Design a protein around this nucleic acid. Structure first.
Ligand code: MG
Ligand code: MG
Ligand code: MG
Ligand code: MG
Ligand code: MG
Ligand code: MG
Ligand code: MG
Ligand code: MG
Ligand code: MG
Ligand code: MG
Ligand code: MG
Ligand code: MG
Ligand code: MG
Ligand code: MG
Ligand code: MG
Ligand code: MG
Ligand code: MG
Ligand code: MG
Ligand code: MG
Ligand code: MG
Ligand code: MG
Ligand code: MG
Ligand code: MG
Ligand code: MG
Ligand code: MG
Ligand code: MG
Ligand code: MG
Ligand code: MG
Ligand code: MG
Ligand code: MG
Ligand code: MG
Ligand code: MG
Ligand code: MG
Ligand code: MG
Ligand code: MG
Ligand code: MG
Ligand code: MG
Ligand code: MG
Ligand code: MG
Ligand code: MG
Ligand code: MG
Ligand code: MG
Ligand code: MG
Ligand code: MG
Ligand code: MG
Ligand code: MG
Ligand code: MG
Ligand code: MG
Ligand code: MG
Ligand code: MG
Ligand code: MG
Ligand code: MG
Ligand code: MG
Ligand code: MG
Ligand code: MG
Ligand code: MG
Ligand code: MG
Ligand code: MG
Ligand code: MG
Ligand code: MG
Ligand code: MG
Ligand code: MG
Ligand code: MG
Ligand code: MG
Ligand code: MG
Ligand code: MG
Ligand code: MG
Ligand code: MG
Ligand code: MG
Ligand code: MG
Ligand code: MG
Ligand code: MG
Ligand code: MG
Ligand code: MG
Ligand code: MG
Ligand code: MG
Ligand code: MG
Ligand code: MG
Ligand code: MG
Ligand code: MG
Ligand code: MG
Ligand code: MG
Ligand code: MG
Ligand code: MG
Ligand code: MG
Ligand code: MG
Ligand code: MG
Ligand code: MG
Ligand code: MG
Ligand code: MG
Ligand code: MG
Ligand code: MG
Ligand code: MG
Ligand code: MG
Ligand code: MG
Ligand code: MG
Ligand code: MG
Ligand code: MG
Ligand code: MG
Ligand code: MG
Ligand code: MG
Ligand code: MG
Ligand code: MG
Ligand code: MG
Ligand code: MG
Ligand code: MG
Ligand code: MG
Ligand code: MG
Ligand code: MG
Ligand code: MG
Ligand code: MG
Ligand code: MG
Ligand code: MG
Ligand code: MG
Ligand code: MG
Ligand code: MG
Ligand code: MG
Ligand code: MG
Ligand code: MG
Ligand code: MG
Ligand code: MG
Ligand code: MG
Ligand code: MG
Ligand code: MG
Ligand code: MG
Ligand code: MG
Ligand code: MG
Ligand code: MG
Ligand code: MG
Ligand code: MG
Ligand code: MG
Ligand code: MG
Ligand code: MG
Ligand code: MG
Ligand code: MG
Ligand code: MG
Ligand code: MG
Ligand code: MG
Ligand code: MG
Ligand code: MG
Ligand code: MG
Ligand code: MG
Ligand code: MG
Ligand code: MG
Ligand code: MG
Ligand code: MG
Ligand code: MG
Ligand code: MG
Ligand code: MG
Ligand code: MG
Ligand code: MG
Ligand code: MG
Ligand code: MG
Ligand code: MG
Ligand code: MG
Ligand code: MG
Ligand code: MG
Ligand code: MG
Ligand code: MG
Ligand code: MG
Ligand code: MG
Ligand code: MG
Ligand code: MG
Ligand code: MG
Ligand code: MG
Ligand code: MG
Ligand code: MG
Ligand code: MG
Ligand code: MG
Ligand code: MG
Ligand code: ZN
Lengths: 59, 101, 116, 140, 112, 151
RNA sequence: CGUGAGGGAAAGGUGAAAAGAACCCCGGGAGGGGAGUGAAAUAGAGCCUGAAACCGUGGGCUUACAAGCAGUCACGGCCCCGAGGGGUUGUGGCGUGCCUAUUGAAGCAUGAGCCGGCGACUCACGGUCGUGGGCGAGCUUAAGCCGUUGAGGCGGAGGC
RNA sequence: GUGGAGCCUGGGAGUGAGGGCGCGAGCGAUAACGUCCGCGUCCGAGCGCGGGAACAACCGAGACCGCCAGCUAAGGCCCCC
RNA sequence: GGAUGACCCCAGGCGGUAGGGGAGCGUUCCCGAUGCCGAUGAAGGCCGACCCGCGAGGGCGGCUGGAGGUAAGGGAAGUGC
């Protein structure tokens, strides 16, 4: 190897174009059928401890 | 009815009521002037050869002024030749009063 | 006494940078780049001032030519006829006539044919 | 007085019977119609020419031995990707491409001329599907 | 009426926090809280506190209603960077910049 | 400059520009190039020019009529209020700046503090002071030695 | 920093006065929001002014069939300010960075990431022309002495 | 022949790496974007402008500034143009 | 022309590297200044499509800034990146 190196400074425009994919997708959340609080689906509700209609966990 | 006149080495189509910018004329503001006619048209049509004898266009001079500054710049690379010159072209403003056919 | 740069240089740079507004990237933001662009733009203007006078005449000639061929003759014939007729109405006006006042242009075409 | 500039006008449709005509000489006229340089109000920065429909493209005629000797060419970008197709075959396979390729090279390069070539509708065989546009038959 | 809160000199790199701040701009206060709660980023903690502190000021100081609040505006500016040495091979020293953020959240009321 | 004479880094092969010592005027904190040093700005203007200048300066005032000669200074004895008396009495209300030239120390002490008055011993007469002022007022004893210098 | 001789930095400014922000609110704190001080608090101690590069937020115009030293000239669309002008750029025309070095550079030859500040034809004495004045077969003083305390004079040794 | 002509005294330089082209030679191989002289020219310093597809020195022509006026030079007039 | 750089009229010159010459602009400082501008706002900063100048620049107006600045005319340089 012979130590490759950038030929030109990346423009503000080109830098920012590269970052057109870097945006975050907001978390996917559904209401908990017991306490109405929002939570990730398929996860035991951290607010009331309910999953599949029953208490699973102390919160 | 329009007319084609010739002032300051250039030609323009004029109708009464029109305001016009031409090259500077040696005439006090407010005075009126007669411009040479190359062609009359609209109702009748007369073709100057090159000018039309009896016809003239009477214009009142509204004033004289200087055009907005243009920057004419000269640059020659690898030589340190650079020139900056500011140019405002003189002009006179006319109001076309009548077309004497 | 001492006369340090002080205020003078910033001011000279701002003159340039204001003149370079609108340009792309560092050309409107960096003094040095602004200057290099402004040099080119000065020569371009001067050159294009001179060539604008050409750009229009060629349009005028194309338009005059279009109206001439409607009456069965070409531009090169039309101009010669006008010269022989002694008509000195310019191409800026001939073109305006060709479009705005077609019957007036027709008459000129007539005198052009009559001249030869 | 500044030079007249036309606002957009309704485009005229034109029909041409290409049968028996000399390829290159018909090409120029269509280019002209496309540009709109036959209109007294011509303006170079807008699409204001005619729409040109051409029929009997396959029945275009050509002088000399070009039918065998004119080689149309296409490069794919791959090694050894230079394809040579003679005129004979081009008429035998996609005849309307002949008038098209000719007219295209006589139109200006860039965005506008590229869109002018879109105003050229060329068909081999006497029939064209633009009866809706009611094209004006031109002798050229 | 608006209410704002600014956390200055937060020891996190502006580029990282903005990613999170962008997630809640123009959202209802309730929706934003829901998002920050389940966003898997370090920045979420910081953006959260500034959001709550801004909501607090709205209810307390500025006569606004918690049930009307939304994130009208939000942005991160960059503060003074913390420069630190990072020893490299063959005796060379590099300089790491541990950056800093000024997080701003501005809250408004959605009437109806 | 105070710094050392050592070459700060080797001539070649560092990837930096070449340098000598940091006292070089190219460096910040380094010496100055062609800056000021102690200097004697005086020169010997031709005596005949100076003398001629004195005469000319007085003449110019004399021609304006701004020159006044006085025989003695009435009641002035070292008090400013006293000079103002006499000054007013002579047509000197302070609306014009006056160079007062006299050997009477007592008269100079009384008039020195006036904003509109410059004071001079007759040996000290000089064209700058004359040109600076609007009026020239002279003791006859002063006007006498003035005559001697320009003679 | 260097074993050592030795090398050798950076770093000044709230306000007239601390009157340096009691108390309350969110926060573990930091920070901030109100309250209060002040003529002024984007004078809040990370404090006069606060340029530029650089980063961001909001708004207007614009861009996903297009070939480019990035501009320039023309026309048109849109936005703004009220026969005009400002911003923007769709299409058309034209168009080989700056500097340095070279016979010749856009050059695939040198230098330069960008911005700000430092940065190079001076001074003394002598010489040689030119030039503005003074005196002119003459012109001029030097060290010193007296005077002044930003006052000028004396001094003829000497030099041309 | 009154010309940014010429001659005389003096102040100030810069240059003392040239290059293409045409014609006349030597050298080379009736080779070189070769080399060394001569007369001229242009580029150098006119990498400003029109032509030669593009191209310092080939053809045209010496750019004080402005004009949306006119005439021409070389080169051109089927379309790109 | 008028008599003198008063302004007007007619005519011709005005590509330019090394380089010679000329005229100016601006920066710090001194005399002018015991003066004058200044909290009804100094300098400096950010604007401007306005005014004067070929240009370097100089004005004027808006915002910022909050205590300095400095004319006509002359003088001297650590004087323009
Ligand atoms: Mg390897
Ligand atoms: Mg390798
Ligand atoms: Mg590698
Ligand atoms: Mg290896
Ligand atoms: Mg590598
Ligand atoms: Mg590289
Ligand atoms: Mg960047
Ligand atoms: Mg951006
Ligand atoms: Mg990229
Ligand atoms: Mg998950
Ligand atoms: Mg619980
Ligand atoms: Mg005329
Ligand atoms: Mg009208
Ligand atoms: Mg004029
Ligand atoms: Mg005009
Ligand atoms: Mg050049
Ligand atoms: Mg160039
Ligand atoms: Mg260059
Ligand atoms: Mg050169
Ligand atoms: Mg140059
Ligand atoms: Mg400085
Ligand atoms: Mg500068
Ligand atoms: Mg500066
Ligand atoms: Mg400034
Ligand atoms: Mg300036
Ligand atoms: Mg722009
Ligand atoms: Mg523009
Ligand atoms: Mg930019
Ligand atoms: Mg950009
Ligand atoms: Mg920038
Ligand atoms: Mg320029
Ligand atoms: Mg021009
Ligand atoms: Mg040109
Ligand atoms: Mg022409
Ligand atoms: Mg021309
Ligand atoms: Mg054109
Ligand atoms: Mg015909
Ligand atoms: Mg003719
Ligand atoms: Mg003609
Ligand atoms: Mg036709
Ligand atoms: Mg054929
Ligand atoms: Mg097919
Ligand atoms: Mg083209
Ligand atoms: Mg997430
Ligand atoms: Mg609350
Ligand atoms: Mg090492
Ligand atoms: Mg770095
Ligand atoms: Mg770093
Ligand atoms: Mg030392
Ligand atoms: Mg030392
Ligand atoms: Mg030493
Ligand atoms: Mg040594
Ligand atoms: Mg040493
Ligand atoms: Mg390097
Ligand atoms: Mg470096
Ligand atoms: Mg070195
Ligand atoms: Mg050194
Ligand atoms: Mg040293
Ligand atoms: Mg120091
Ligand atoms: Mg020092
Ligand atoms: Mg020092
Ligand atoms: Mg220095
Ligand atoms: Mg030195
Ligand atoms: Mg010196
Ligand atoms: Mg001394
Ligand atoms: Mg001297
Ligand atoms: Mg002396
Ligand atoms: Mg006094
Ligand atoms: Mg005193
Ligand atoms: Mg005084
Ligand atoms: Mg005094
Ligand atoms: Mg050691
Ligand atoms: Mg030690
Ligand atoms: Mg050492
Ligand atoms: Mg240092
Ligand atoms: Mg203070
Ligand atoms: Mg203090
Ligand atoms: Mg607490
Ligand atoms: Mg608490
Ligand atoms: Mg704890
Ligand atoms: Mg606190
Ligand atoms: Mg807060
Ligand atoms: Mg507080
Ligand atoms: Mg208060
Ligand atoms: Mg006040
Ligand atoms: Mg402020
Ligand atoms: Mg302040
Ligand atoms: Mg501050
Ligand atoms: Mg202060
Ligand atoms: Mg700041
Ligand atoms: Mg800034
Ligand atoms: Mg944006
Ligand atoms: Mg396509
Ligand atoms: Mg598109
Ligand atoms: Mg436009
Ligand atoms: Mg507009
Ligand atoms: Mg363009
Ligand atoms: Mg080239
Ligand atoms: Mg440059
Ligand atoms: Mg070299
Ligand atoms: Mg070389
Ligand atoms: Mg070479
Ligand atoms: Mg290149
Ligand atoms: Mg390069
Ligand atoms: Mg390159
Ligand atoms: Mg080299
Ligand atoms: Mg270089
Ligand atoms: Mg570097
Ligand atoms: Mg940059
Ligand atoms: Mg010298
Ligand atoms: Mg002399
Ligand atoms: Mg003398
Ligand atoms: Mg003597
Ligand atoms: Mg001697
Ligand atoms: Mg000459
Ligand atoms: Mg000569
Ligand atoms: Mg000579
Ligand atoms: Mg000289
Ligand atoms: Mg010299
Ligand atoms: Mg030499
Ligand atoms: Mg030699
Ligand atoms: Mg030689
Ligand atoms: Mg040689
Ligand atoms: Mg030779
Ligand atoms: Mg021949
Ligand atoms: Mg030969
Ligand atoms: Mg031979
Ligand atoms: Mg052979
Ligand atoms: Mg050769
Ligand atoms: Mg040869
Ligand atoms: Mg030969
Ligand atoms: Mg030759
Ligand atoms: Mg050379
Ligand atoms: Mg040439
Ligand atoms: Mg020449
Ligand atoms: Mg060419
Ligand atoms: Mg050429
Ligand atoms: Mg060509
Ligand atoms: Mg070209
Ligand atoms: Mg060429
Ligand atoms: Mg060649
Ligand atoms: Mg002609
Ligand atoms: Mg010819
Ligand atoms: Mg051709
Ligand atoms: Mg022919
Ligand atoms: Mg083409
Ligand atoms: Mg044509
Ligand atoms: Mg003239
Ligand atoms: Mg000329
Ligand atoms: Mg010249
Ligand atoms: Mg040279
Ligand atoms: Mg001269
Ligand atoms: Mg300056
Ligand atoms: Mg000056
Ligand atoms: Mg003073
Ligand atoms: Mg004062
Ligand atoms: Mg006052
Ligand atoms: Mg006040
Ligand atoms: Mg104010
Ligand atoms: Mg100052
Ligand atoms: Mg200004
Ligand atoms: Mg204020
Ligand atoms: Mg101000
Ligand atoms: Mg004071
Ligand atoms: Mg000042
Ligand atoms: Mg002053
Ligand atoms: Mg002055
Ligand atoms: Mg003076
Ligand atoms: Mg000095
Ligand atoms: Mg210096
Ligand atoms: Zn639940």
């Amino acid at each position: 190897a012979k130590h490759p190196v950038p030929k030109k400074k990346t423009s503000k425009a080109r830098r920012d174009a590269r970052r057109s994919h870097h945006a975050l997708t907001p978390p996917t959340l559904v209401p908990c059928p017991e306490c109405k609080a929002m939570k990730p689906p398929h996860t035991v509700c951290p607010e009331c401890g309910y999953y599949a209609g029953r208490k699973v966990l102390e919160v | 009815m329009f007319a084609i006149v010739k002032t300051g080495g250039k030609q323009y189509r004029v109708e009464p009521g029109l305001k016009l910018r031409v090259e500077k004329l040696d005439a006090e503001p407010g005075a009126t002037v007669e411009l040479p006619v190359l062609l009359l048209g609209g109702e009748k049509t007369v073709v100057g050869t090159p000018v039309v004898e009896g016809a003239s266009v009477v214009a009142e001079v509204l004033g004289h002024g200087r055009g907005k500054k243009i920057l004419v710049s000269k640059f020659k690379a690898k030589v340190q030749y650079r020139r900056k010159k500011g140019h405002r072209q003189p002009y006179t403003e006319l109001l076309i009063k009548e077309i004497r056919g | 006494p001492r006369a340090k740069t002080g205020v003078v240089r910033r001011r000279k740079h701002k003159k340039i940078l204001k003149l370079a507004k609108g340009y792309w990237g560092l050309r409107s933001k960096s003094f040095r780049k602004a200057r290099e662009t402004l040099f080119a733009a000065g020569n371009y203007a001067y050159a294009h001032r001179k060539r604008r006078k050409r750009d229009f005449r060629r349009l005028w000639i194309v338009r005059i030519n279009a109206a001439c061929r409607q009456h069965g003759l070409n531009y090169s014939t039309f101009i010669h006829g006008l010269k022989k007729a002694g008509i000195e109405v310019d191409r800026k006006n001939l073109a305006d006539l060709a479009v705005r006042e077609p019957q007036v242009f027709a008459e000129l075409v007539e005198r052009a044919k009559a001249a030869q | 007085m500044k030079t007249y500039v036309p606002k957009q006008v309704e485009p005229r449709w034109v029909l041409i019977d290409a049968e028996g005509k000399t390829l290159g000489r018909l090409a120029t006229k269509i280019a002209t119609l496309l540009r709109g340089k036959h209109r007294p109000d011509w303006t170079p920065n807008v699409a204001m020419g005619d729409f040109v429909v051409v029929v009997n493209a396959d029945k275009i005629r050509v002088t000399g031995k070009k039918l065998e000797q004119k080689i149309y060419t296409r490069y794919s970008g791959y090694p050894g990707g230079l394809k040579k197709i003679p005129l004979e075959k081009m008429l035998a396979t996609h005849p309307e491409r002949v008038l098209e390729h000719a007219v295209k090279g006589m139109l200006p390069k860039g965005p506008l001329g590229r869109r002018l070539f879109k105003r050229l509708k060329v068909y081999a065989g006497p029939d064209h599907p633009h009866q809706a546009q009611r094209p004006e038959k031109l002798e050229v | 009426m608006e209410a704002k809160a600014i956390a200055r000199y937060v020891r996190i790199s502006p580029r990282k926090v903005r990613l999170v701040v962008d997630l809640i701009r123009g959202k209802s206060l309730e929706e934003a809280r829901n998002i920050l709660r389940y966003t898997n980023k370090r920045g979420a903690y910081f953006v959260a506190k500034v959001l709550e502190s801004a909501a607090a000021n709205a209810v307390n100081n500025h006569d606004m209603l918690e049930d009307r609040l939304y994130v009208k505006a939000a942005y991160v500016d960059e503060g003074p960077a913390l420069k630190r040495v990072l020893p490299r091979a063959r005796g060379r020293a590099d300089i790491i910049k541990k950056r800093t953020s000024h997080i701003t959240v501005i809250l408004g009321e959605k009437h109806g | 400059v105070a710094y050392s004479g050592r070459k700060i880094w080797p001539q070649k092969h560092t990837g930096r520009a070449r340098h000598g010592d940091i006292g070089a005027p190219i460096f910040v904190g380094g010496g100055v190039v062609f800056g000021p040093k102690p200097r004697d700005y005086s020169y010997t203007l031709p005596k005949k020019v100076r003398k001629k200048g004195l005469a000319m300066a007085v003449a110019d005032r004399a021609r304006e009529g701004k020159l006044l000669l006085v025989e003695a200074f009435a009641g002035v004895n070292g008090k400013t209020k006293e000079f103002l008396a006499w000054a007013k009495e002579a047509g000197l209300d302070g609306s014009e700046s006056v160079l007062l030239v006299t050997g009477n120390e007592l008269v100079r002490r009384a008039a020195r503090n006036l904003p509109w008055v410059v004071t001079l011993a007759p040996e000290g007469l000089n064209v700058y002071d004359i040109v600076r002022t609007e009026r020239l007022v002279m003791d006859l004893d002063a006007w006498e030695v003035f005559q001697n210098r320009i003679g």
